[PDB]
Amino acid sequence: GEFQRKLYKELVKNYNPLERPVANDSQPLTVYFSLSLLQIMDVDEKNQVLTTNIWLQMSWTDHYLQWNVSEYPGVKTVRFPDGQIWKPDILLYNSADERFDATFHTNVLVNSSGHCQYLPPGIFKSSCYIDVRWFPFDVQHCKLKFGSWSYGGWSLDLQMQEADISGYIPNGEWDLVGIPGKRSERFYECCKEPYPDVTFTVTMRRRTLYYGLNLLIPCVLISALALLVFLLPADSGEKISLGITVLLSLTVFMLLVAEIMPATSDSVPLIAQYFASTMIIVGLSVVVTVIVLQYHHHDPDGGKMPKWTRVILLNWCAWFLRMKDLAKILEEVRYIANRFRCQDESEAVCSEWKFAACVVDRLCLMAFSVFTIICTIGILMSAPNFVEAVSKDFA
Amino acid sequence: GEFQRKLYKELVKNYNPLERPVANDSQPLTVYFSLSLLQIMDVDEKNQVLTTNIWLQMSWTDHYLQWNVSEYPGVKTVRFPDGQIWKPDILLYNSADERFDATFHTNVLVNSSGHCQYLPPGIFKSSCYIDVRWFPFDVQHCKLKFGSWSYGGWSLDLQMQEADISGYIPNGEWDLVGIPGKRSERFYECCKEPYPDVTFTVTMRRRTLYYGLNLLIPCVLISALALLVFLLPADSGEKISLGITVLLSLTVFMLLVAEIMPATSDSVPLIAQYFASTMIIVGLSVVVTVIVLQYHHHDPDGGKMPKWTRVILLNWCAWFLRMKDLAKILEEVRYIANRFRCQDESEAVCSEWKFAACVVDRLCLMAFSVFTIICTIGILMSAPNFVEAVSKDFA
Amino acid sequence: GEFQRKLYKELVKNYNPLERPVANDSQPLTVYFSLSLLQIMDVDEKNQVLTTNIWLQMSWTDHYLQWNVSEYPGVKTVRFPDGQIWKPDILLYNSADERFDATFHTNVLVNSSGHCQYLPPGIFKSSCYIDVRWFPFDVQHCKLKFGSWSYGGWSLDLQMQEADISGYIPNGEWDLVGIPGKRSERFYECCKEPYPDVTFTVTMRRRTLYYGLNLLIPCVLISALALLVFLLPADSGEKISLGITVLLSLTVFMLLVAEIMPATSDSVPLIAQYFASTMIIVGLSVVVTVIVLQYHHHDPDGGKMPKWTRVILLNWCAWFLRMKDLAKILEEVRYIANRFRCQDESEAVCSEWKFAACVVDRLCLMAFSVFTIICTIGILMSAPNFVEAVSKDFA
Amino acid sequence: GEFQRKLYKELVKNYNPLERPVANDSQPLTVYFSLSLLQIMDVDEKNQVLTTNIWLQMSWTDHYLQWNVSEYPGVKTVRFPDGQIWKPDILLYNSADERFDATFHTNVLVNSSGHCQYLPPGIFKSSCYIDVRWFPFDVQHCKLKFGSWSYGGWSLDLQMQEADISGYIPNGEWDLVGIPGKRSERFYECCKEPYPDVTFTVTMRRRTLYYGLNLLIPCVLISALALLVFLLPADSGEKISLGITVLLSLTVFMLLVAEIMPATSDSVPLIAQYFASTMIIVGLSVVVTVIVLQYHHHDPDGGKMPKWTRVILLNWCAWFLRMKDLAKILEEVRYIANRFRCQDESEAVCSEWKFAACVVDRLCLMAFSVFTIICTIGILMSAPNFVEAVSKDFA
Amino acid sequence: GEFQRKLYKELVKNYNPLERPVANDSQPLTVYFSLSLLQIMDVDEKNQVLTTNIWLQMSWTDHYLQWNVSEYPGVKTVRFPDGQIWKPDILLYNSADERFDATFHTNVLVNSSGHCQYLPPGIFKSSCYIDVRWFPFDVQHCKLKFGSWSYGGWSLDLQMQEADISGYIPNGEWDLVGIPGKRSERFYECCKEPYPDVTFTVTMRRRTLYYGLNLLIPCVLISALALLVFLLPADSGEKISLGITVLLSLTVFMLLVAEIMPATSDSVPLIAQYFASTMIIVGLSVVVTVIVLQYHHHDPDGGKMPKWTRVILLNWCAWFLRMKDLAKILEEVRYIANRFRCQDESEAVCSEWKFAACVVDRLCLMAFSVFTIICTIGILMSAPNFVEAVSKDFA
Ligand SMILES: *[C@@H]1O[C@H](CO)[C@@H](O[C@@H]2O[C@H](CO)[C@@H](O)[C@H](O)[C@H]2NC(C)=O)[C@H](O)[C@H]1NC(C)=O
Ligand SMILES: *[C@@H]1O[C@H](CO)[C@@H](O[C@@H]2O[C@H](CO)[C@@H](O)[C@H](O)[C@H]2NC(C)=O)[C@H](O)[C@H]1NC(C)=O
């Protein structure tokens, strides 16, 4: 138009984009700063970073960009691109990014009274420490610290406004708890002036539905599958063909677990020690079934059945469980009969040994069950906010 | 040439690329906006993004770029690069991109009446929520929301035109259903002026041919392979050498399944619960086998054959199935005969127990089949648009 | 030098890099366009793109860049950087690239008569549809479509020249067949002027040596390894310990196959159905060997040997195969003799059943071999250009 | 303001950003250089690089940027962007980076006396040699070498200041030991002037908690699980059903080990030879078992029991271990008796052979245990700072 | 300073950065070119590229940048940034890079006589053909071809200088052999003037320590572990439980081999055919075992022991190996005796068949050993520079 052309020609005359737009040079310039969170992109525990989508919001006042609306009855606001007017240098301090800015400087909008507003959108990669002591049941607090790079507290004083969580697009893996802000001042013992900054604390909680279905339940159908070796009669020629195949079927289960657990060496995750306990129990279940077949396959005429074995394994532990010419012909037939009687005696001795083996089997069955139940309950229930997680997530 | 040189010199004289090219400054500038979809590149459920190839199209009118064709009889159109003439600032709102623009501003073509046309091509990464409750049979709706960053409804009013699906280059994994557009206005209670925007809704459907061939059929040849353990006589020493090898051969099958299923914890996918049901059925098929070999390997002189076991397992359930000197020599020979008779009696008792075991085997065979059939049919048929998917994809 | 300094000062005087360098403004400017292919980098079937290394070549004539060599006896050619003289705006149309250009604008060389030559090198990512119906034996045709963005046919008319395949650096995975070009004109019913474009069609063929050695022969040593279960006597207690281990040894073979096959759901690849046939045959080989051990382990006094079973399995199918006081002592000894005779009769019945089982085993052996041979030959030989591929690749 | 506007207009008048801001051109310009480490991002042994987060700090003095505060009572400091004033050209020498700079040049702050301070933040990818001879127990020293690209020692002399490790954000995988600095001068035999440079040496130590729990303990529960094959009686038909399944269950354990061990061919890592020893011991445990069942399954009438075998295996090694008409009837019965006696003699011979086999089994059991214990202790304890690592990490 | 300010103001007066800085325009400008290799980053055989770290070095003379040191007694050298003075346009020809330059143009240093030096550092991605016929024992020659883009031999003649291998930082995977250079001229039949270029040939050798320890030895302990099946008596019910588990334990070994071997289809690597031979031998070892148990489990009264089988398998091949009223009572007892004699005859026939089986077992054992030894030695020793590789690498 005819009027905005001359307005734009007049506004930028004798304008310096390097000076602070204040009328006295001794008074601070109040800048209002706010943030808007759009979505949480990633939380990386390897490099300890947090990738989020954020729109900043900055507002201030300019003194050399004022005009009278009556003289220009067609224009009420103007817009200036990057590098033509003064803008605050507020930027993220952590900024664990390659280019360190990720801001995409957009246009700046100015009213007829000089009130300037500037909001750039971006994807921010902050650096926060991640604690993974309780890997599945985890709650994290990360920080975003904003401030001016080269302005003091008597030139550019930051002010804080509440964030905006409208339109959050929930992640589906991390449950956002909150994001409060706080403004702080840091004095230095050379200047006696403040250096304000504004920090926002994102607090979030991990969802434990995928891990409780794809990791836990699979490994409780295998830990309890080993115990069947204590209910299988030893007469069948397959007692380690089942005991050693459950261990191999679970060793291949750790190939899809190692792609989930973290690689940090600071602490031992809860799921790691749970899986270690399952490993140890399944491995130790195979040791016992070798001390049972030694009892079952004992030589009839190569042992003595020690008295202690007969008392412990047949009287005490078996009552708790509630188990319970003519002369030559005569000589030849007598020989055959004696042979048969000797075989019968050997069979009786073998039967005693087999009963001892069965008693051992039931004794070993009765204890591994309580062991695995106690371990499974205690390891999982030791973590805090476990009841909170199972109430919010499953139910 | 001689004429276009002076035309280009004259057009850019006293021209400001910051002002809106209108003749009154109080009338809106109508801008026509349209879109062209070239292909769908990716749909990422981890970060919940959608990558597509799109050519935007913008058209408007300029007032300071008008000339008379009679005075310049050689030129009818002109072209201006980026940064030399005014262009609308319409841009995507979601834009879950690092650089946030992905536009590649090309040249602007101007006719002899000022009608300007500008179409930049690009690859756009929008952010839309993805629901994966029914993972294989899935239908998704995503949105692309375009508007002006810093212009109101009384300065730059958007207008909508239909999209263009010519030359779509079908993806081969997602079946496009449609892409309709809609224009909306959003009033604010400080200005009483509209802020129009234009949104296009891409609706697409997932193709279920790869999943039905590479995932389902493999796991129906293994779920039905376990049932053979109920048709194998127990005399052979292989009843757990087959029962436990099918479970291990399916545990290694979940290594190529975990690379397909999503990792979202918001809901339980249909394929996940189907695979869990298969897991549970195959695991429980091994528990029953141990309770069959206990019947087969029973001690002849260590039990009593309870009456209930004899009635249920041999009378009722067995009829539904339609199973059905001289003195010493004499004494020695009599001893041998009595021994043989005792062995015969023991063999008869063992035979009764083996028949009971066979009856149990057939009873257990008759039920697991209906269990697996019911589960397989019901889980898959519960999803909506299942008939539509199988009609469009397979047939 | 003294002369080229004044030449450069004189050439760029009153020069506009925005106008078309023609002497009448009504005559077209002929631009000669050609291409040079350096190597094929990648062919991605997921996003359906083709990445290649290409040097374009453009030539035209300029009217304002002419000088007399006699006046400047030291200079014959000049060079201008990007942004100082007019260049054609020919670019790839498909250009499924993030930055959409990938051109690296180099210097422009000008002779003493204005003849300008300009060749930029780059890596181009085109978008072409990939058909994978016959995955190993595959032939692909992709297109590269070049043209001017904003110039008609009466201002900048494209001309075509043959490509240059010298220095091709063969890929080692794709065998290049050819690359012919074609020029086309597209009229529009608003202007009645042509809009020429130039398209080059790269035709290539896949090499099938890696797949035929690392995927096929592996799975013919396992498909034929299962059949040995039909040559193993049933007396040994290992018949399912071999049948079920070949299936598990091939289920783990699909872990290194799933990383090669494509994920497209448009059609079923040939190798996919070949592997499915191998899976089905190996799985069905285990069903039969359970109906053989049922015949071998039959109870002597629990069946009747149906007449049909005796005729089919022992007369017809067995001839095709070419298989083929004193009283008490007397009473006791007579009892023992009768016992022995009964045992002999039972053994004879068992022997008959075992012979029936062996006949079944040979009958089942004779058919699976022809099944697998027919499937293996027919599935592979059904693809076209199979003889061409095996002649060019292996021999 | 009114005053800083004229100050900025006056400072940049007749200013050249190419000249060194010194007052005599023959005196050196002292530049103070310091570094601040924020966190360690990665240590890559494949390409031998180290990625860290670092803020440099540079300070110097300018002569043309001095003003009087009394004349401008409102301003005390000024700020200049990149490309408007002179800055030192100190950069990292190693800089194994694509863009080689990674600096993000920020603003430069100037006091009222010309003292300039400039600190750019960035992510630096240095190139240092990594020694992995002792892979788990590893200590690394990497270098960062800074200096001026094109300034001598008589123009820009570097000065060193101590680093700053405040706010380190510990990595959780590498334990930082220290980072001392050193300044050096390098004369050349053409100029006789120094060329100073400043080098910082980051010394760090690897944490060995993850490797000692997820790699070692798993493989000590499998190496010791094979030895059970020497405590399992040979009467049960499972002795290579356990010996060969432990080897297969640990062959699948090397799939999750190969993703951790380095691929360098310069030296043999300690964990590699430890795993090789476990491979060899477990594989050799199966060879012995075959030489035990040959003794157990010896033919009664097909051998002689050599004298050496009887002395070594039954006298010496068995005492260390502390093992320990009427005529025809008469003829027929005598025949039966003789048959029985022959069978008894054969059984006695078989019993002798089985005892020899058991002695061999115990002899082989007693040695593999000490072998594996010695190997496990010696291989791990040979590395230096092993006690230091286990004291700092585990306890 | 006062003097360098006026020197900088005077040098750039009337200076054109587009002209060649020569004093006659008819004489060539000699440019000295050299290279410095810092480290080898990668050698990729998929896309056939080579990534290295290189500092170029260029030197020439300028005519308009000369001054008298007496008039400016404080300055001896000057520095100019990119884009202010003339620089040669030498660049890499292959340059299989996205941006095609990777140069990072630094400052240019000029002495008081005009002698200019310019050395940019960078990471270069060249394109060279990689031959992988002998994958472990491999020697590669790649080329780097430098030259001027648009200057002839009568304007800018290249000169060559030796490279600099000081500070090489050895890779640890590729052993550098050398890097010699060569300068060449290429005439064209339109101009009759040379077009010189400079090429450096990097020759390197692969280190074979990782492959010889992590791939070969693992697959030698498994190839020789199968042969134990020929030393295991058939009485034990484990002869296929060991033969088929070694094949499955080696099928899972190809999962960590497929991540190492190349995917090129141009030629078959040596390691590929070695692994194929191991596969074939291990698979064929199981076929023979089935033909041994057919001999051992032969029916006593279902065969005839063909004469050829008795001569070959028991006379010739067994000598090479050095194997070696009263009437009824009488009738009943006679019946029992006859039964016993028949059983004895059947047992004798079975014993003959078992001896034949043992002879077959030893005959098969004696040949597979020489087969595997010959294959293993011949395949590895066929490659050239094998002795050189094992001498430099292992010893
Ligand atoms: C401008 O700021 C600089 C900051 O370095 C001041 O230099 C330091 O000033 C303090 C104050 O006395 C001294 O203790 C230090 O020794 C100074 N540093 C050096 C390297 O000398 C400088 O004095 C300030 N100038 C004015 C006029 O305030
Ligand atoms: C400016 O520096 C250049 C650096 O190359 C000097 O050129 C070399 O000078 C040495 C000193 O005598 C000679 O030995 C070399 O032969 C020169 N190089 C060449 C390629 O000729 C140059 O002399 C210096 N000029 C002044 C005035 O000091």
Ligand SMILES: *[C@@H]1O[C@H](CO)[C@@H](O)[C@H](O)[C@H]1NC(C)=O
């Ligand atoms: C600027 O502020 C100071 C106090 O902060 C005041 O003394 C001075 O008068 C102000 N400037 C003007 C021009 O009034």
